[PDB]
Amino acid sequence: TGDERFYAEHLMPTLQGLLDPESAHRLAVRFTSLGLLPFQDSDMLEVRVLGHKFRNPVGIAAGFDKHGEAVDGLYKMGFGFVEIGSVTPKPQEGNPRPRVFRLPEDQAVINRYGFNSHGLSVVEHRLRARQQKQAKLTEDGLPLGVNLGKNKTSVDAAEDYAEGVRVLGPLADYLVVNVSSPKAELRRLLTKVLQERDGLRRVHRPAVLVKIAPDLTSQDKEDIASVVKELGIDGLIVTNTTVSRPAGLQGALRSETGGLSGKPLRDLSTQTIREMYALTQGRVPIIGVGGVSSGQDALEKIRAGASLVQLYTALTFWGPPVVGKVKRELEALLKEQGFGGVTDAIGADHRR
């Protein structure tokens, strides 16, 4: 479309020339929360997983709406589901600025926000203000995830996550235990999270997913797969940003400390999805995330094992029109490869 090219070629590069990345992000959140924004979802794109219907499989990843401020505008942007957070129990400011950096030559970002968060209480009241509106959205196929973090100074990480389950669990369709911001400990932690979740009333009882790094050893991945199956965890989010720096980065800021996202992460993420799907025998839904910017990127993750995908960094470079672009391209590729819909493509590479 013309909007896609105007954002990609003129408006976004101009904004990025004028505004450092954090200021640009804060502007984006403000415009999105006000619905100041520039494709019709088809039956082909609908997915049923995690106990919910998803009108389309393209979600906004954690970190864009850390504090729950822009949820309705994100649905207006065309995302099939929204994940807010990470939210920490107490408020905290995060790292000093600058703490995010663009790598324009790499179509990548590096960030070290350090879990800046309004905290559970503020976000709780924010979501309560729209709780019934969200109930209708979810019933209409637009679910809400909440990603839970822990405070920097906390001495008892499992209790931080337990607090998040109790406070925001009742407001979420799914919860994310993000143990991956840049075996028996994980079993202990997840047992406690699942017990707290199971103690919520049924109408307020969310799915629980674990979000992992792209930087794990083979042993780590095998151990996570084992614990997730043993405990009955509902899903995996694969992956967070990477602390690696692939050979070939050109950005001047490539050696900043932080998590790398965008195109250089893409195929590391896709391979991690592929491995986790095989290690769980296809029985544990996966939300695939990392360097998704096109319909081909999305379908590669779906064929590798993802039931849903998310993006963030692509929005920062290409702007809101990228969402409809990904969905349009995904639908066209599904038809070209002979899938009746998204659901038939999930894990297809493992059946070749």
Ligand SMILES: Cc1cc2nc3c(=O)[nH]c(=O)nc-3n(C[C@H](O)[C@H](O)[C@H](O)COP(=O)(O)O)c2cc1C
């Ligand atoms: C600026 C920024 C902040 C992020 N903060 C979070 C966060 O609070 N919690 C989380 O689980 N991931 C967070 N992420 C990771 C994204 O959710 C996603 O896993 C990662 O960026 C890969 O997707 P992408 O390449 O499409 O950006 C953040 C990413 C960015 C770029």
Ligand SMILES: O=C(Nc1c(F)c(F)c(-c2ccccc2)c(F)c1F)c1nsnc1O
């Ligand atoms: O969020 C960002 N940009 C950014 C932006 F500056 C926008 F104006 C809109 C935007 C434009 C029109 C309506 C709503 C948001 C946006 F989505 C963005 F991602 C961003 N994060 S790191 N570097 C960046 O440029």
Ligand SMILES: O=C(O)c1cc(=O)[nH]c(=O)[nH]1
């Ligand atoms: O620094 C953060 O808050 C953050 C960054 C990131 O890339 N992933 C995450 O989970 N948190």
Ligand SMILES: [Cl-]
């Ligand atoms: Cl802090």
Ligand SMILES: [Cl-]
């Ligand atoms: Cl920068």
Ligand SMILES: [Cl-]
């Ligand atoms: Cl509590």
Ligand SMILES: [Cl-]
């Ligand atoms: Cl409630």
Ligand SMILES: [Cl-]
């Ligand atoms: Cl680092």
